[PDB]
């Protein structure tokens, strides 16, 4: 592997919630969509795995 | 010559009731302090946008002056960050000497 997958992707949710200046935190909706795709693909892969082999 | 002033039963009862009264007065006070804090925060929130706006024009002013001071001195502007974000200055150019005073 030349790619590292974060063991803890929840670091994107880190950050103090106090004394936050406006425009300090970057927009991470595209990060959220990458991790949403990944969850949906594993759900579907497993669904194909245990539904196309249980019939 | 036993006296009730030092008998354990009146003392524990007296000490107990004092602690409950003080614990009633602590409960009410901290509840008032926490509501005074709510009004202090909302008071600073309604002022934060006017105060930040006057700061923001000052940051735009000095940055545009520093960008010009460079173009007139070094012939161009040296890019520090590859991003277009405004980063608040760490170092500044300073006159060689302070005002006489």
């Amino acid at each position: 592997s030349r790619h590292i997958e974060l063991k803890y992707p929840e670091v994107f949710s880190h950050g103090s919630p106090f004394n936050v200046p406006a425009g300090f935190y970057p927009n991470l909706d595209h990060v959220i969509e990458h991790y949403r795709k990944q969850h949906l693909e594993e759900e579907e892969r497993k669904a194909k795995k245990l539904a196309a082999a249980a019939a | 010559p036993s006296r009730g002033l030092f008998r354990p039963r009146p003392l524990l009862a007296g000490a107990a009731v004092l602690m409950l009264y003080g614990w009633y007065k602590l409960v009410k006070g901290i509840r008032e302090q926490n509501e005074l804090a709510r009004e202090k925060m909302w008071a600073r929130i309604h002022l934060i946008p006017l105060l930040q706006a006057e700061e923001d024009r000052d940051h735009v002013r000095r940055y545009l002056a520093d960008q010009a001071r460079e173009k007139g001195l070094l012939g161009e502007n040296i890019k520090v960050y590859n991003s277009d974000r405004y980063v608040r200055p760490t170092f500044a150019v300073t006159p060689s000497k302070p005002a006489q005073e």
Binding site: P9, S16, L28 | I78, E101
Partner: protein, 102 residues
């Protein structure tokens, strides 16, 4: 990179770190090896936020040109500090004009 600063938070360089983590996760995978190359500039911006070496280098140069430029031009009358402590005050309009040289 923790996201918590000395005054109740957040940390000054935390935006660059999240911008760097976002770039790596969303452009680099096992399919494309060179996706991480779009991260090279973003990492420099984060190494620069923490250490400020390139900014120091710009200022040392710009400051040397500024001092060598204001050390040779003719000076009419430098404003005293007391004059520049009355700048923008409600009753010292004469001193504000001198500071502004307008």
């Amino acid at each position: 990179a923790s996201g918590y600063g000395l005054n109740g938070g957040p940390s000054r360089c935390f935006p660059f770190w999240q911008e760097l983590l976002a770039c790596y996760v969303t452009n680099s995978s096992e399919d494309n090896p060179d996706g991480k190359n779009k991260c090279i500039p973003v990492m420099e911006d984060y190494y620069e936020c923490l250490h400020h070496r390139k900014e120091a280098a710009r200022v040392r140069a710009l400051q040397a040109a500024y001092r060598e430029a204001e050390a040779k031009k003719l000076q009419e009358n430098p404003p005293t500090a007391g004059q520049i402590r009355n700048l923008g005050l409600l009753n010292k309009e004469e001193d504000t004009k001198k500071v502004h040289c307008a």
